[PDB]
């Protein structure tokens, strides 16, 4: 109780301290001019007329306004189908407005480069090769394709078991793309308003068209309504419209033109048939569980950073992993280091990995990995 009193006394002391403690030219001349300065609400012109132009503008939700040009403007500068700013009080186009950037679509563009080389991805040479000629070689050297008169697929679908490396390869392509890479946020495409997301998909293609040669990565295609049950309830009707808008813009009545689309799905079966149909996505690069040479290579790349005895045999460790995804092989390397940290040995040994191989695969409830059955030897 005395110890509790000491804390209460400490709180009382803090209360005494708090009570005792209690006991640019922009903000100058410019403000006087700024308050009178008038506003000009943005609006979009749809048409123009002879003699008095009488340009009629839809504000954005208000009305079609027949507004004459403002006195201090050039009639030629105001143009049909051009965003403009109209003062509410003077009801005239005081100043024209530059075209809307639509920043949310601009945000999805990667802009930065992920620092992953193709070297880090391992055990999938064939999958890398297939991606190289739909992503890097057609863009880097189109002449070879033209010589055989063969068009590039212009579309790729990466599908495989989870943790295989589909996205890891995609970030590697982004590192050396030498062309705009547009990662797409799947949730962003779904929107509260009906078909608001569909409008965004048109913008996505429009942005892609403006840039010359760009690759769009629709990771998690299932998020972008990648199914078309389209039942009578039509709960997914808004998303289904968004999916169809992507399909038409992707191909039909003039397709991507210079856009290569990379789509990655853990479950390929769920994807809607129209998207799966080629032309929209000509290549079907499925990633697969790595073979023993691949399993050794993934172990070597993951363990190169870790400090370990030089005599460790990755081939034995890979053999002990019968069907392991790349992520699980990475999990063995990290777990092996954690066991060495637990015993406080700075340099790990082969035994540490074997304990990890049991922990990452056998210890997990795989059941097949842990054997209690004598059955087979």
């Amino acid at each position: 109780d005395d110890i509790q009193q000491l804390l209460k006394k400490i709180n009382e002391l803090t209360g005494i301290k708090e009570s005792d403690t209690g006991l640019l030219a922009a903000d100058k001349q410019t403000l006087q001019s700024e308050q009178p300065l008038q506003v000009a609400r943005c609006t979009k012109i749809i048409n123009a007329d002879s003699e008095d132009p009488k340009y009629i503008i839809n504000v954005k939700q208000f009305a079609k306004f027949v507004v004459d040009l403002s006195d201090q403007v050039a009639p030629t500068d105001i143009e049909e189908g051009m965003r403009v700013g109209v003062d509410r009080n003077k009801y005239q186009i005081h100043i024209p407005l530059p075209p809307k950037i639509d920043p949310t679509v601009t945000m999805m563009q990667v802009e930065e480069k992920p620092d992953v080389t193709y070297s880090d991805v391992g055990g999938c040479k064939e999958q890398i090769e297939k991606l190289r000629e739909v992503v890097e070689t057609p863009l880097l050297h189109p002449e070879r394709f033209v010589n055989l008169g063969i068009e590039p697929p212009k579309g790729v679908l990466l599908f495989g078991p989870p943790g295989t490396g589909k996205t890891l390869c995609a970030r590697a392509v982004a590192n050396r793309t030498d062309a705009c890479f547009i990662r797409v946020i799947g949730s962003e495409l779904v929107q509260k308003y009906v078909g608001e997301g569909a409008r965004m998909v048109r913008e996505l293609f429009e942005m892609a068209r403006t840039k010359k040669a760009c690759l769009i990565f629709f990771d998690e295609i299932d998020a972008i309504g990648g199914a078309r049950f389209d039942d009578g309830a039509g709960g997914d009707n808004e998303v289904q419209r968004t999916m169809l808008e992507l399909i038409n813009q992707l191909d039909g009545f003039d397709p991507r033109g210079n856009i290569k689309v990379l789509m990655a799905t853990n479950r390929p079966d769920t994807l809607d048939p129209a998207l799966m149909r080629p032309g929209r996505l000509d290549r079907k690069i499925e990633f697969s569980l790595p073979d023993l040479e691949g399993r050794t290579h993934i172990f070597k790349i993951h363990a190169r950073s870790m400090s370990v005895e030089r005599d460790i045999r990755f081939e034995l460790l890979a053999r002990l992993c019968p069907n392991s995804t790349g992520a699980e092989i990475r999990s063995v390397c990290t777990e092996a280091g954690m066991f060495a940290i637990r015993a406080r040995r700075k340099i790990a040994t082969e035994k540490d990995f074997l304990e990890a191989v049991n922990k990452v695969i056998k210890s997990y409830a795989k059941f097949s990995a842990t054997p209690r059955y004598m059955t087979y030897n």
């Binding site: 709180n11 209360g15 903000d27 100058k28 943005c42 799947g186 949730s187 998690e220 870790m306 280091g337």
Partner: protein, 370 residues
């Protein structure tokens, strides 16, 4: 009667929290700012200082900015504050996250350290190496070359106190702890719910070291089954956004995820994979030694007769959970109060176990058969 001092400490703490302008420069800004200021998105930036600002009414008129403290913070997607009438950008953009995200952040953990938990020491070791140890001693992981495991799943039968480990982590964590149930993403509006998952993660990155607890993850992500009837859950889209945040392009920075499920088989394979849950922790029903520590901890702060045999209750009945042990201790105290004895006899504990375990009926004729 030392309670009065404790009550005073609590009241004093509340008072302390309750008790937690320039002569000309501030007054000029006060005049410049409107009595009501409306906050809206910034759509376009123009060098003249008249920048297009989007609003709920959509008036995007270019508006001058005169911010005394700084006007260089303007960015696309920033929520600028505008005068109700003039609509000019008043000053530094408002910087507050969405209200639903604010509720998750937890500053006070009721439970103490791992001391209350008994017999889950192996489970404590795993949570510490993934959560507490990397922050306390970052050098060890770098020297090994290992990158610390960032994700953990606690899976166990009902009442194994998986949540208790999470409460214990909250008690001793440098990282801000965001406690979000998996069932707290029921947003009716199409969209919004996957966006809320993005919001929780962006806040975690803003708070730098952070621990995310998602109790009952079964609701947010299970199976990833097809639409079937065509109702379309949209929950699968929400889970896919979480899957994207944990390991879907970019990076997770320094955010650690703890997730708890009564049933782990139902959870979809992609979510429960290395890279989203590097370490997996299993809580088994307590055995005998684990039961002894739990029984002692629950009875530590109550009157105990010499006659009571803690070992007899633990050995005689096998299957009771750690929560069941606490219930037996609370029930035994009530059984004694019926006889008006504050002290608890061995007889009370024996009666208590029977009352608590009356709903648990298991097994069929699997006795003679094997």
């Amino acid at each position: 009667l030392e309670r009065i001092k404790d009550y005073l400490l609590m009241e004093e703490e509340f008072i302390r929290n309750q008790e937690q302008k320039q002569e000309e420069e501030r007054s000029k800004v006060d005049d410049l700012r409107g009595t009501p200021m409306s906050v809206g998105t910034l759509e376009e930036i123009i060098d003249d200082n008249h920048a297009i600002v989007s609003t709920s009414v959509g008036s995007e008129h270019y508006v001058s900015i005169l911010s005394f403290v700084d006007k260089d913070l303007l960015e696309p997607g920033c929520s600028v504050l505008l005068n109700h009438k003039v609509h000019a950008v008043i000053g530094v953009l408002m910087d507050d996250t969405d209200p639903l995200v604010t509720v998750m952040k937890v500053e006070k953990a009721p439970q103490e350290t791992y001391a209350d938990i008994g017999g889950l020491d192996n489970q404590i070791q795993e949570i510490k190496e993934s959560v507490e140890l990397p922050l306390t001693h970052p050098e060890y992981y770098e020297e090994m070359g290992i990158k610390p495991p960032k994700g953990v799943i606690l899976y166990g039968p009902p009442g194994t106190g998986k949540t208790l480990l999470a409460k214990a982590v909250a008690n001793q964590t440098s990282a801000t702890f965001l406690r979000v149930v998996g069932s707290e993403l029921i947003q009716k509006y199409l969209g919004d719910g996957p966006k809320l998952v993005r919001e929780l993660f962006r806040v975690a990155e803003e708070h730098a070291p952070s621990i995310v607890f998602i109790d009952e993850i079964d609701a947010i992500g299970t199976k990833r089954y097809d639409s079937n009837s065509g109702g379309e859950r949209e929950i699968q889209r929400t889970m896919l956004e979480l899957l994207n945040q944990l390991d879907g392009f970019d990076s997770r920075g320094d955010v650690k995820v703890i997730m708890a499920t009564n049933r782990i088989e139902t959870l979809d394979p992609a979510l429960i994979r290395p890279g989203r849950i590097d370490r997996k922790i299993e809580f088994p029903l307590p055995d005998e030694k684990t039961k002894k520590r739990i029984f002692q901890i629950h009875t530590s702060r109550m009157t105990l007769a010499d006659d009571v045999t803690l070992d007899d209750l633990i050995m005689a009945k096998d299957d009771l959970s750690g929560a069941d042990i606490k219930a037996i201790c609370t029930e035994a105290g009530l059984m004694a109060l019926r006889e008006r004895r504050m002290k608890v006899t061995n007889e009370d504990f024996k009666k208590s176990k029977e009352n608590v375990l009356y709903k648990k009926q298991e097994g069929t004729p699997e006795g003679l058969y094997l």
